[PDB]
Amino acid sequence: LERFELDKRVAQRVKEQMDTNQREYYLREQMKAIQKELGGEDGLSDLEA
Amino acid sequence: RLELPVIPLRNTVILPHTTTPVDVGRAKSKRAVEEAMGADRLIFLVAQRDPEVDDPAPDDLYTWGVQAVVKQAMRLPDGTLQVMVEARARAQVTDYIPGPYLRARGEVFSEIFPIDEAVVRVLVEELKEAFEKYVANHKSLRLDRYQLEAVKGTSDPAMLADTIAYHATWTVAEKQEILELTDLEARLKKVLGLLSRDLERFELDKRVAQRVKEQMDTNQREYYLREQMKAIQKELGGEDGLSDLEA
Amino acid sequence: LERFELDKRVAQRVKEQMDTNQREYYLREQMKAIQKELGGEDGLSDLEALRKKIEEVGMPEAVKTKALKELDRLERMQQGSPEATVARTYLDWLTEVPW
Amino acid sequence: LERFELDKRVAQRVKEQMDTNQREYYLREQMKAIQKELGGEDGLSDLEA
DSSP, X not given: OHHHHHHHHHHHHHHHHHHHHHXXXXXXXXXXXXXXXXXXXXXXXXXXX | OOOBOOOOOSSOOOOBSOEEEEEEOOTTTHHHHHHHHTTTTEEEEOOOOSSOOSOOOTTSOOSOOEEEEOOOBOOBTTTBEEEEEEBOOBOOOSOOXXXXXXXXXXXXXXXXXXXXXXXXXXXXHHHHHHHHXXXXXXXXXXXXXXXXXXXXXXXXXXXXXXXXXXXXXXXHHHHHHHHTOSOOHHHHHHHHHHHHHHHHHHHHHHHHHHHHHHHHHHHHHHHHHHHHHHHHHHHHOSSOTTHHHHO | OHHHHHHHHHHHHHHXXXXXXXXXXXXXXXXXHHHHHHSSTTTXXXXXXXHHHHTTSOOOHHHHHHHHHXXXXXXXXXXXXXXXXXXXXXXXXXXXXXX | OHHHHHHHHXXXXXXXXXXXXXXXXXXXXHHHHHHHHTSSSTTTHHHHO
């Protein structure tokens, strides 16, 4: 029964690891989407200039 | 003019002519409701000082306010005295004799009256289409959707602004700068501008939601394609990255 | 008509400058929440003290635009680094000298 | 009563040391089977070496 309790415990730790990985991916793409919308006015790059 | 108890608040700003439940959950303040019934059942609602304190003080009010009045005599047996109000009109303070219990020496109401009413007609129909599509857009409001279909037909831009700008969330200092002028049709313009900024931030949210989704689908496509490349190297196999190692 | 419309276009620039820069207020508010949940604190109180100290000391406006082009390469990276700390201390050394 | 209190406490902490053994043992079982399926039985030979 201790073995089964240990299985539930590592099951929950697994699922939480997944969801923080997923949301941190989501939010870095949020950040860069917002970011290039902000830098929308300037589209000129240094090498093209 | 009849001095009235300024009954203290948590965060809620009231506009005139609106039935509103005020939940007096403070034993420093329910006795101010006893003093309100000892003051012709009358209230004078002045805004609580921002970021909140829990003390009725002279350093915990503002420089305007409105009067209200009891509608239900509701007791809650937990330390709260629920009062139903309806705000009258805007006035101010002659002598705020401080507290417990706080009062202001009451005024008469500030009485501004509409001229230039066809611009008000254009701005009421702009308000109408604006609030219409505001309800249609912001579904984070979860609003009652059976009401402006009933109350569209009136022309009372005071009461129109009251009930229309009442139900919807924008912050406390904006409630202040509506509450804190005698200027009428400019504050109607202010409400319309609030609606405009609502629609603006709505559409900017939409835009960055779409940029999110296309970056997601792009990364998934690029992963699928790099696996197509790997497996093509596999089923060519003569081009193994390995017989060079055995050689 | 012509003078009223001069004042009208003045109020047009008033409205659109308020719209645009309160709109960027909204967008940086979103970046506050995002940087919080990913890293530590509100970006460890970064890029807000620098942004409020560029506008207040001095300065010639070419220096100010030069600094605002250096805040934008710290919107792309904050981790580490052997790369972003050089521009960080560069703009620090810029903003701290007197005008 | 006192001597048998001593016996019961020392035996229960014998079971506590057995609980430490069961924790580290069973989790070591799980982690080495996972480390094996991340290996080919090599990556299991050379790391123990």
